[PDB]
Each structure stands twice: as C-alpha cells, then as structure tokens.
Design a protein around this ligand. Structure first.
Ligand SMILES: COc1ccc(CCN2CCC[C@H](CN3CCc4cc(OC)c(OC)cc4CC3=O)C2)cc1OC
Ligand SMILES: COc1ccc(CCN2CCC[C@H](CN3CCc4cc(OC)c(OC)cc4CC3=O)C2)cc1OC
Ligand SMILES: COc1ccc(CCN2CCC[C@H](CN3CCc4cc(OC)c(OC)cc4CC3=O)C2)cc1OC
Ligand SMILES: COc1ccc(CCN2CCC[C@H](CN3CCc4cc(OC)c(OC)cc4CC3=O)C2)cc1OC
Lengths: 432, 432, 432, 432
C-alpha cells in the first residue's frame, strides 16, 4: 500500500533534501485521511506510461479511421473505442484524486476545487463517447456526417498529452543533465508531424462530406475508387505542400471550403516553420560558447591595442602571449577556485602542485601550496633583476630543466609555466 | 472639471514620485491659462479608447466598401463616412490642445509649433472628406474612378493608429510587468494581417478600374458576376499566395499592372516574413536564460579541467559538486544580498536561519545570524583536522542529525548543507 | 595647393589628437617630395563623390543598354562610353598617387608596390574600352556577340565601388554615431537589388545570343517584337521569381542554358535571403537590451528565491522592491560613477543632492555630498531601532515630508527614497 | 622507422608541453611492443591525405556511374572499383593499428576492443565489394537491379569521411587561429551539396528500375534516349527544385514511389536550409561585438540618466565625454593589465609613458611609471582648486603644450589626455 507515497530516489533526495524530509512527506501523505495519490509516487508513473501510449495510439489512428474508411461498424473498431473510453474515464477518476504541484495534498478541498476550476471540462468532453449517445437516442447521410463530426471530439486529448509530457520532462531535468534546446526542438518536431498528419485527413475529410463535387481535387484526379493508402498518400502530399509553402495544383482552387482550408494550412505551416528556425538558431548558438567568449575578449584586447597606437611587434607579442596563455578558450581561474569547497581545492592542489615541492609538518606544506600563483612567460623575457621565489613546471631557463627553485640574471629560453610564493605569504604561513 | 488634470494612480506615483509631485503637476496644469489637456489624464484615455475602435473599423471596412461594391450611393455608407469625418475632425481639434511628452504643457507657443512642424499635414489630409468636395464642384466613369482614388485618402489614419498604440503600450509597461517581445510580435502580427487585407482589395481594385480586360485573372476565371464574398475570397487567396512566396496561377502574368503589383507584394511579404522570423528568434532566446547561463559556466569549468589535465574521477567529482550546489541554475548569492535593503535581508535571514540557533539580547542573535555563510559538502569529504564553528541543516555527519553545532574527526556521510561563523566575525560581534 | 593635405576637422582631431599631430601630418605630406595625395584630404572626397555617382550610373545603365537595344551605334551611347572610360582612367592615374591606410605616404616605393600587388589588374581591365580595340583591329553576328561579351567587362567596377563605400562608411562612424546593423543591412539591400537587376538582363541576354530558339520563354510568350520596357519587365519578373524561390512557368525548362542559369539564380537568391534574415535578427536583438538584461537578472533572482524555498509573501515583496528600485531597467550606479571624471561627478551630485543639505566651507559641503549613498525603502519597513543619519527626498515617514534629517522609532508609510552619510565617512570629512 | 612516432612541431609543443613530454610520448610509443601507429604522427597524416581524396572521388563518381550508364562492364570502371576496394581494405587494416584519442596507445587490448565495439561493422560493410561476390555465386534484369542496389553499399564511406574531417579540423584549431563559425558553415555547405548531388541520382534511379513507366517524368518529357548529361541536368534540377521548396511540374505526381521521394527530399531540404539560416545568423552576430557592447553600455548609461531626471545639457555632456573617452569601442583597461605578465607590462608602459618623464635610478623611474593613471578631461572643466601631480600628453591647458607637469587655477581649453601619480603612491615608491 506504499505505492501511493513517494519513495527514496535520487530525484526525491534532490527535491526534498535528506531522508527526514522524505519521511515527513510520507507521513504527510499518510496523514491526510484518504487514498490520496502523491504526484511523485510510482503509481502515477506506471499509470501515465500506459496513458501516453494510448494517447499516441488514438491521436494517430482515429482520424484515418474516421475519414478514409466507409463502414464504421466493424467489430475491432468498436472494441478499440470502448477500451479507449474506459481508460480515459478511469484517468479522469484518478485525476480527481492526484496531488497538484504548484505540493497541495489536501484531498477534499484543494484538489477538487482546483480541478473543477482549471481542467475538468476539456477532459470531460474528451473522455465520454459522445457519438454513441446520439446514435442510441436518434436523411440518414446527414446523421452519419453529424456522428462523424461528433466522433471527432476525441482529439481533445492533446491537452492532456501536452500536460503529462511537460510534467515528466520537467521531472527529468533533475535526474539527468539534459540540454534544454534539444528537448524543446524534439517537442516542436513531434507537434509539427502531428499537425501535418491531421491536415492530410482534414483535406480528405472536407470533400468527403459533400459527396465529392466535380470541382474538388479528388474528382479531378479520378481517385475516388482507389484504396485508402493511395488516397492517404495524395492527401498527405497535398497537406505537406501547403504546409511547406510550395504551390500544389495546376489551377487555383475553385470551391469555397478549399480556399479557406488552404489559407489556414498555409498560415499554420508558416508559423511552425518560423518557430523551427528560431529553435535551430537557439540550438546552434550554444555549441561552442567557450570558443566564442575568447574571441570577444580578444576583440576587446586588440581594441585596447588600437586605442593607444602600439607598434606591430608588441601587438603580435600580445597575440602570442594570449595564444600560449589561454589556448583559444575562456575561463576565470580565480572565480572557479572561489566557488568550490576547501578540501576539494586541497585535492586539486595536491594533484597539480605538491610534487614540485618534494625536494626541500604536512599542514605547513599544504598552506604553502595554497599560497601559490600561476604564471606564464615568454622567450627573451628575462625574469630577475640583479640586486620572490619561483618553481619550474615546463620550459627552459638559462642563467633549467623541469623542476627547480630560486632560493632567496635568469632568462627564459622557451615558453615557461612557473609558480610563485612571494615572501609576505611565506611569512604569514610561518606565523601560522 | 478635474478630468483634464492627471489623477493619483499607481502609474502617476511611479512616474512623478510622491503625492507632492502630482499636486505640483496639477497646479502646473491649472496654472497655464487655458483648457489645457494633460496627456496622462482620464480624458485622453476615454477619447483614444473610442478613436482606436473607429480607426480599426474604418481601416477594415473602407477598402472592401470602395472596391467590391458597385453603387456607392447607399444611405448607411454616407452616414458612416459623415460620422467618421466628424470624429476624425474633432480629434484634430483636440490634438491642437493636448500636451506632448518629450511634459510640454505650454499651450499657445510650444504645442502649436510642435504640432504644425511634425504631424499637421497627414492628419489634415486624412481628416476631411476630399472626394465629396470634388463631387460638389464637378466621361463620367473617369470621374467615378477619380473619386474612388480620392476616397482612398482615408487610409492615412494608420499614422495616427501607430502613434496612439505606441503611446498606450509605452504607458502600460509601467502599470504591469510585460515581456517586451510579446508586445513587439503581436504588433507585427497586426501589421501583417492589415497589409494582407489591403493587398487583396488592391488586387481586385486594379482590374476593376480598367473595365476588366480579357488578360486579367478575373476574366480568365469567369468570376465577374459572382457575389462580393466569392470575389473577396479569391482576391485574398491571390494576395496571400503572393505574400507567402508561393506561385499562383498557370501562366505568368501578362498585363503590365499585374507584374509590378505582383513584384511589390512579393517584396513586402518577404521583408515582413523575415522580420517575423527575427522576432520569433528573439522571443525563443529569452525563455530559459537561467538554464543557459549555467550551461555556459559549466563549459568554462570543464575547460578549466582540460587546461590542467585532471584525472577523470576528480572531474566527475566536480560535476557532482556543481549538480548538488547549483541544481542546474545560475545565481549569485553575494550580489543579490548586496542589492537589497537591510531589514528585508533581516527578514530573509530570520526565515532561513535563526531557527538553528534556537538552542544556546536579540540584536546579538541578529548580528550573529548576519555573520553566517553557506556551505555544501560531499560524502567522504571529512571536515575537521585533529588539532571555526558549524551548524547542520541537512545530511548525516559521523564522528549527526539535522541541527547541531561544533563548539570550539567529523566525516560527511551524505550531501550536507552547513553554516559557518568563524571566530573573527564572532569576536567582532562580541565587540559590538 | 593645400587641398592635398588633411585639414583640421572633428574627424582629424578624433584620429590624430591635438592640432600638433595634424601639423606633423601636414609637414609629413609636404616633406615627401611629390604631389602626394593624402587619403583623408578634401581632394579624395571631392573626387570619390563624383566617382561613386558615375559607378552607380554605369552599373545601372550598361546591362540594359547592351542587352535590350538592337543598334549600338547611336551617338550618345558612344559619348557616354568615351566619357566613362576617360574618368575611370584618370581615377587609375590618381590611384597611383593616393595614400594607403593600413598611413603609408611614401610615394615612389610603398604605394606603387602595394598597388601593383593587390588591385592593379582588376582596375586595369575595368578601365580601358576593350571592345573598341577589337572593333578597330577586326560571320558578322559572331563578331557582334563577341564584342557584346567583351563590352560586359565594364562590370568589374563593382570591386572599386565596394572599396570606396567601405572606406567612406568606415570614416563616418567617427564623425557621427551610427548603429552598425543599419549600415550593414542597407549595404546588403543595395547588393541584393543590384544582383536582381543583373539577373534580369542576363536572362534576356542568353536567349538573345542564340537568335531566339523556339524552346525559350521569349518565343513561347510571343514577345520578340514588343518594346524594351515590356521585355525588361517580364525578364525582371522571371529573375525575381527565381531569386525569391517561387516557381515560374508552366513547364520545366527545356534548353540547357536555361536550366543552369535557373539553378545559379536560385542558389544566389537563397544565400542572399539567408543573410538578410541573419541581419534582420541581429538588428532586432539590439533594440531593447536594457529591458532584456533586467528580465534575465530577475530570472536569476526568482531562481535564488526557489533555491531556498521562500514563502509567497516574501517573494512578492522582493518583486515589489525590484519594481520600485530599478523600474524595469538595468544599470549599475557604482561602475558608471567609477568611469566618469571628478568635476563632472561633482556636477551630477550638485544637481541631485546639495539642495537637501541647504538647511544646516563649500569644500566641506562637497565632500559630505560625495560621501552619500542612495537607498529605497518600503511601507511597513521601519528604519531605526530604539537605542547613521538620513535625508528625505520623497515619501512619507511617521515617528515626515520631502526634506528632513535625523540628527544623531521611524516608520515608512509609503515608498521612500532616502540618503545616508554614516558617521565614519563624516569623521573622515571632519579629518579633511 | 620514426615515422610512426609523433615529431616535434608547434602542435606537439602546444599539446604536450616541453620537449621532455614529447620524448616521454616517443618512448611510450616505442615501449609498447608492436608497430603501433601514433595518431599525431606523420604517417597518419600522409595516409589520410590520400584517403580523403579517394573518398571525395568515390562519393562523387559512383552514383553517376551506377545510375545513368547502361553497360557496367567497361574495363576502367572495374579497375577503379578494384583499386578503391584495395585502398579501403588497407585503411581498415591500419585502423586496427592506430591510436585513439579519448591517448590510448595500448595495442593488443584497448584498440581492438574499442574498434570492435564502435565502428567495425560500418567500415567492414563499406570496405569489401559485396556485388561481385553475388555475381560470382549467382530473370536477369532482377539480378542486375539487385546487384545495383548491392553496389550502392559503397556510400557508407561518408561515416569515415566525417570522422577524418572532424579529426583534422580539431587538430587545425591549435596550429592556426580560425573562426569557428566559418569552419562549421563550410562543413554544412559541403554536406548540402553532397545531399543534392545524391538526390539527383536517386530521382533518376527510381524510374530506372521500373523500366520507365508512362506516368514518370522521364517518359512525359520524352527524354529516355538523350545522353547522360542531359538526363543528369534535368534530374539535378528536379532534385534542387524539391530541395529548395519550389514546386516542379505541371501535374501533381501520380506514382507512389514519386510521392514519397518528393516528400522525403522536401523534408531534408527544409531542415538543411533551416540549419543554414542558423549558422548564418551565428556568423553575423560575431563580426562587430566590440561595437555592440559599447552600444549596450551606453543604453545602460542613458537609462541611468533617465532614472535621476538629469537636464539635457548634462546628458549631452556625458555623451560627448563617452565619445571622447571610448571612441565607440568597449574595453576594460584594468583587467587587461591584470591578465598580462610583468615585464611585458613594463614594455607597454615604456612605450606609452617614460618619455614624458624625460625631463626631471632607472628602477625608481619604472616604479613611478607603473604608479600612473590615465585621465580624459573636457574644455571648461577646470582642474585644480586654489589652496596630486599631472602630466600632459595632448590638448591645451591655460593658467600648456604637449608635455609639462604641475609640481607640488588651471583650465582645460580642449580635449586633454593627462596622467596622475598622487602623492601616496609617490611616497610608497620613495619608501621602495
Ligand atoms: C552512470 O549512470 C548512468 C548515467 C547516464 C545514463 C544514460 C541515461 N540517459 C541519460 C540521458 C537521458 C536518457 C533518457 N531520458 C530520460 C527519459 C525521457 C522520457 C520522456 O518522455 C516523457 C522525454 O520526453 C521528451 C525525454 C526524456 C529524456 C530522456 O532522454 C537516459 C545511464 C546510466 O546508467 C544506467
Ligand atoms: C493582483 O492584481 C492584479 C494583477 C494582475 C492582473 C492582470 C492584469 N493584466 C496584467 C497583464 C496585462 C493585462 C492587459 N494589458 C494591459 C492593457 C493593453 C492595452 C493595449 O491597447 C493599447 C495593448 O496593445 C498591445 C496591450 C495591452 C497589455 C495588456 O495586456 C492586464 C490583475 C490584477 O487584479 C485585477
Ligand atoms: C548638432 O549637429 C548635428 C548633429 C547631427 C546631425 C545629423 C547628421 N546626420 C547624422 C547621421 C548621419 C547622417 C548622414 N550620414 C552620413 C553621410 C553617409 C554617406 C554614405 O555614402 C558613402 C553612407 O553609405 C551607407 C552612409 C552615410 C551615413 C550617413 O547617414 C548625418 C546634424 C547636425 O547639424 C548639422
Ligand atoms: C607567419 O606564418 C604564417 C602565418 C599564417 C599563414 C597562413 C596559413 N593559413 C592560416 C589559416 C589556415 C590555413 C589552412 N587551413 C589549414 C589547413 C585545413 C585543412 C582542412 O582539411 C581537413 C580543413 O577542413 C575544413 C580546414 C583547414 C583550415 C585551413 O584553412 C593556413 C602562413 C604563414 O606562413 C606560411
């Protein structure tokens, strides 16, 4: 009976904190006197995993089944509709009982009023079979067309599909690290494919209800008596050619329901393609930002060069210095060491340094190693004046190899990475 | 008589300041000797609310009424034009008297010269009925076509509609918080729909004035003697197919007014669709910026990892530390507490802290609570050396539960959020 | 004779500095022994103003004059070509003598070698009349077509037009403040219009050289014997329909020069329209950046709210505080006062402050006024504890009106903007 | 035998460091007991330079050779296929032996398992001639069509081409400074051209296998018995018209393989063009960032002006100050001097300063020159009060010329750039 309560996962510990907050939430669920269903429990997961599959199945199969087929009295179609109505009614019954993340777990007052205020009507319309009631209660062709238009009320399950998809993918940013633009662009691709699939069925459906006039494209292309696969292929081609702004037929369209459907599909396709270009741009601009911020910083540097009118050899020397200091990449070594915790910084220092001070109290050694600084030099650029202590990591130094010190005229022969521990910090560590 | 003066609203207090500045502005309006109209008063609001509705009504109805209908001597059309001319003349009379935000409320000198210099001519042209004067003063078909082209001068009210819309939506950024890109993109959508509606009427209007030559599309499609709804539908379809860059008919266009109108509508549609893509991109890039700045910062962090060639276990340990420190979100807790005022920071501290120091002078307690710091640790990462005081918010610590202190070998067993009050700040508070 | 030397303008003082650097540059021009022409002088300006007009005139008139007209032996055409050849030869002669901004004013060595290395050949080809030489030196229709293809070598003046336009608009960023994206987008619009105008003439030119085969569109549309205006209109419509990716005719194109010209114009139009979308996006993203950085900062603030799980009343109180502190706008008052000079800051302080300290040594007053700080409070938020001095700019305070002080239980009744001069800074000013 | 080992280049010194790390890597390659091939050596470079040329040659020639030609038994075709199979088998043999940058140079364990896990199958399929085996082992037209479909398995060499191109261009960001967006956009242009070239051959290939039905476009346009150049031109035109979303023929397509190929090419072309717009936008936004950050900063400055309601003369004075301080360009002179090394800063100071202190111990002079600060003033803005030392670089000062000092009422007549060395720093240098 603990399936209604939230368990102890990585997600529950990231949301609530320690195990004590999770046990407080479990006692809070068990304290409201009901069979209350917590929205992070396993039961909602196992239920919505079934419901998303049934939603995708219905939203793909139902327009093709309504429009293209002739006799709607086949047995597996009726079985399919009855089972879909049963599950989408039980999901409404459980939506009476679930918790709402704003977590409002008060069953008799908060959940009922919040569900009746926001999303009861759309789920109630999309749940029950409306057409079969009118068939039991009740010029037969007008009745059949009216029942087809009533049976197209099943497509209001998209408002539930969007809600459950947004809930699960809002959960799954915390269990796993995900790029946001990828999630947004695949959500948009799914929406675009679903809209194109609906426009195909709609552009066959509208000449269908008029008993195929001689002006429509179906009668012109002489394709009334083919199979449903051929008709679906041509209708989907027509819908995709209107959606991607192509230009379909020989003539301009003649009938009045053709013109307005054409214009509607053109507007929907143009807006969807504009949002697709926007998501593609937002995804491309976040691939190599570390190689872009360095470029902007070097633009500012050469602007500083141009403001003071420096000679050309000095400018190419600055260029070589930044190439061998940052290596085409932007990072701030002060703030990164500022943000971290202390023994993890001790680990990073014990990896990088603390092997160069092997020659000549461990806590004294760690304090000296924390008191260091990183420097990059250049050949010809001599560092000492005749009349601050260094260590050598790389490069050549003439007055040597990797690893030495200058105990208190030294010229750099190549690119050298050095360290420094200048005597004020050393005296502070001696005081410690 | 106080309707001409600005009242005391949320907007007036955000603009001018206290009530004293508002009373100074009211005395300034009452001191200029006139019936001067202040541009933030209620009278301009109640006037422009009527004028925007009349502008939308005229700019939708008038091209359809001029082009498609045959006899323009129906009585309600003349009544509609007379009432529109009356209101758009009275609006000119009141635009002589209004104040101008640059607020220049000097009536006889500043307002008259500024209005005559900038926008008197366009409002004067779009105000008066030009066609009826030529009809009273004055080959009859050329006269009727000339009066239609003169009656198309009513469409210079768009320059007033743009001005009033920009004034009100510049006001309504301060009464309510609004995203800027939403306002920009709905302004562009309104402009695009209005331009498409005008291109439809224009592409029926140009074959209309030539007594329908046999080369034009109206004579080819055999649609001279249909109703005006059918003709408007086909003309709007042709205009939208040129605007969205489709490709309309079987043949290339033949007549010379067809080719240049076609090219003009193609260029206008291409530029409008490019600006729509630009606004859509600018709106998409401002949805999840807090989830993007964290991504860029972590790119810089892993670049810092790659610059010093750290081992893989240390890199995944940094990754886990940032996941459980920032939780996929960028914020700077130092600058946010820097920007705020002092007792509001005392409120935030009294909510978060000041319950953990419940065990063991209230001002002393508030000073100690302001002297705290926030820390996040990791399991295995022990924090103390044998031979600074902490508090526990979450996690487990072995040598415990949530809430304890280390009064002056402690190992973190899980993710722990701790506090710190190191003895220098404590001695400063003891000095206070 | 001083027209060859740079004068004293706003631009010369912004580039070189004081008048002494300008006089050094004038002596440098007069010291190189030549009639050397400095590239910032008035003579190059007055010369290039003529040359840009002749370039636009030639690059518009010459393709229409070559392709559509039949007899090329009219007198004003020959006069026009002779005068154009004369001016574009004299411009080459002066390009031997001008200075080069890299300013290299050394005449006999630097300028000649740099001009012969980079851009001598293209200007030499586009300068001289090539076709008339072949006409004097030399199946007549092949000769006429060959002279037309040789006379199309005049269109290599675009490489000079681009160079002079970039030089002048690089100059005119410093004389006047200009948005960069506006300059870029109008340069692109000019290039796109010129390319479309060339594609029209080219798509009439290619069927022209083949003596109008029956497969081409000119023979199909029966438009060989119309005037040149009709043919230019249809050719430009065909070129613009290929460029904006429309779909032109009934059939697919049949001949082989039609297909490759069609594909070439489609590729050029697609790339130009993509760069136009890019420039439009870059222009839109730089209109309301100050209203966007505030939005991003408030996203970070509400993220900081969500990280610590604050109550709702505190969150809306932070929201009201930022609305009445920054007013939907981002600025940093510390760094702006950091960047400025000292007496200008004294001017800003003497405007804002120094009227509130009117009640109760002027240098002492200026030091106290520099030692102030700006604060914003909130109603209910009382500021003093029973048992730092303030000034009042706005709001109401109960224990008052605008302008008072607290000389060393005060409750804010409304939004209050206050000042502060806490006693350490006051003691430092007393020490001064 | 040292060609398998990495040599000493600029790239090897930038990657590994000094010469000692390179010699350690050479001893590491020579210590694994094999003929192991290091992935940065010269041998992989000289091998992949041949392999990229063979890949481009095969991926251009093979679809045109399979589809359009009739008899595939010509001798140079068989020689070409045999040589291509030989080289792409030897490349597999060497891919067994190469090192893998993750550098894993362990031959018998790491490389074999990593290559068998990731990319053995695709290279094995694309290496061997599959069709000739079925021809040796084995209604003849079905056999010929089946061998053509088997011989189209050679096009899985694109997965190797992408890998080698990404490896070399990841190497060549470090040998030379390159803009990233240029590399990305030319990679995308190459991919788009290759996909269009494949769609042309595919849209001729599909009617080819059906023995040219009368519904297809080849039989309609009466182009079965032309040469292969004409057929390739029309097929590539059809593929490019579907890819750029044009609208190709008179009728809608009739056959079922036509419709789905048409829709597939439309979707691929739309996605490629959207990514091209994204790369073009990302390239345009990185051209003039230094002229954009100044614009954003000045927006913040004028917002700070509007927040405090400053007079207009003060606002234009701030505008003139920023124009003559930053010159339309953003840079931070403190952080740039912070990032650099010390003797290079001494070089920059010795260029800019140290000529103005020529009048009135060299180390003392360098310390005073490091203790300076840069200031910009304005005419009318007098700087001294009657009752800090300066130097003059430009401008005029009345109580002069360029270069003077104020040894401890001076009015600036023009724009002046000055220096400062205020007495605390001078006393510190005297202490040094
Ligand atoms: C070291 O431990 C491991 C680390 C990493 C891994 C690899 C695990 N992988 C990490 C990336 C996410 C992926 C699956 N995922 C989640 C489920 C889901 C469901 C959706 O339907 C609502 C959805 O809607 C768009 C989007 C998504 C997003 C999504 O992609 C699982 C395995 C590990 O060990 C097993
Ligand atoms: C707690 O107090 C409340 C807080 C919040 C609310 C919700 C109030 N809502 C907040 C958002 C704006 C909206 C209406 N709005 C303003 C009027 C207008 C007119 C225009 O024509 C010129 C226009 O042109 C584009 C654009 C707009 C923008 C616009 O959308 C009103 C109610 C509250 O209590 C009643
Ligand atoms: C208070 O003093 C004043 C302040 C301000 C003004 C308004 C003066 N205005 C300021 C904006 C620029 C404009 C003209 N301009 C320069 C000439 C040019 C030539 C080009 O051809 C190469 C070009 O190529 C794209 C682009 C441009 C850009 C361009 O627009 C002149 C007047 C004032 O007093 C007179
Ligand atoms: C002062 O010393 C010099 C400084 C500068 C120079 C100019 C040298 N130049 C600098 C820019 C890169 C260019 C060639 N380059 C590298 C090779 C390659 C191969 C590719 O195939 C995989 C590729 O795939 C997209 C992309 C690229 C990128 C690319 O453009 C060489 C010369 C110098 O002296 C000789």
């Amino acid at each position: 009976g603990t399936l209604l309560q939230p368990t102890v996962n990585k997600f529950s510990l990231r949301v609530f904190g320690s195990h004590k907050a999770v046990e407080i939430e479990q006692e809070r669920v068990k304290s409201a006197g009901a069979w209350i269903i917590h929205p992070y429990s396993d039961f909602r997961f196992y239920w919505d995993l079934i419901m998303l599959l049934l939603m995708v199945g219905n939203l793909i199969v139902l327009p093709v089944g309504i429009t293209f087929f002739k006799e709607e009295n086949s047995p597996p179609w009726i079985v399919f509709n009855v089972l879909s109505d049963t599950f989408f009614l039980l999901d409404l019954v459980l939506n009476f009982r679930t918790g709402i993340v704003v977590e409002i777990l008060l069953a008799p007052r908060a959940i009922r009023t919040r569900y009746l205020r926001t999303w009861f009507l759309v789920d109630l319309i999309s749940s029950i079979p409306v057409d079969y009631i009118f068939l039991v209660v009740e010029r037969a062709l007008r009745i059949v067309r009216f029942t087809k238009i009533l049976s197209l009320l099943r497509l209001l399950r998209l408002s539930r599909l969007i809600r459950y998809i947004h809930q699960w993918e809002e959960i799954f940013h915390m269990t796993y690290d995900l790029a946001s633009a990828v999630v947004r662009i695949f959500n948009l691709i799914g929406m675009m494919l679903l809209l194109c699939h609906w426009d195909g069925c709609l552009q066959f459906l509208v000449p269908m209800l008029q008993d195929f006039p001689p002006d429509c494209w179906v009668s012109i292309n002489h394709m009334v008596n083919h199979s449903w696969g051929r008709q679906y292929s041509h209708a989907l081609f027509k819908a995709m050619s209107h959606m991607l702004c192509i230009g379909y037929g020989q003539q301009a369209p003649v009938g009045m329901p053709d013109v307005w459907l054409t214009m509607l599909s053109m507007i929907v396709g143009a807006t969807c393609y504009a949002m697709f270009i926007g998501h593609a741009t937002a995804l491309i601009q976040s691939l190599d930002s570390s190689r872009r911020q360095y470029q902007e910083k070097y633009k500012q540097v050469e602007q500083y060069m141009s403001f003071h009118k420096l000679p050309a050899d000095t400018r190419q020397r600055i260029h070589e210095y930044y190439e061998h200091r940052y290596q085409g990449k932007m990072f701030d070594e002060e703030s990164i060491l500022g943000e971290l915790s202390e023994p993890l910084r001790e680990e990073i220092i014990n990896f990088t340094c603390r092997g160069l001070v092997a020659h000549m109290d461990p806590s004294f050694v760690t304090a000296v190693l924390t008191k260091l600084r990183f420097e990059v030099f250049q050949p010809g650029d001599l560092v000492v004046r005749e009349g601050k202590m260094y260590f050598i990591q790389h490069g050549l130094l003439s007055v040597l190899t990797d690893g030495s010190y200058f105990g208190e005229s030294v010229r750099a022969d190549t690119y050298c990475r050095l360290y420094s521990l200048s005597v004020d910090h050393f005296n502070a560590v001696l005081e410690e």
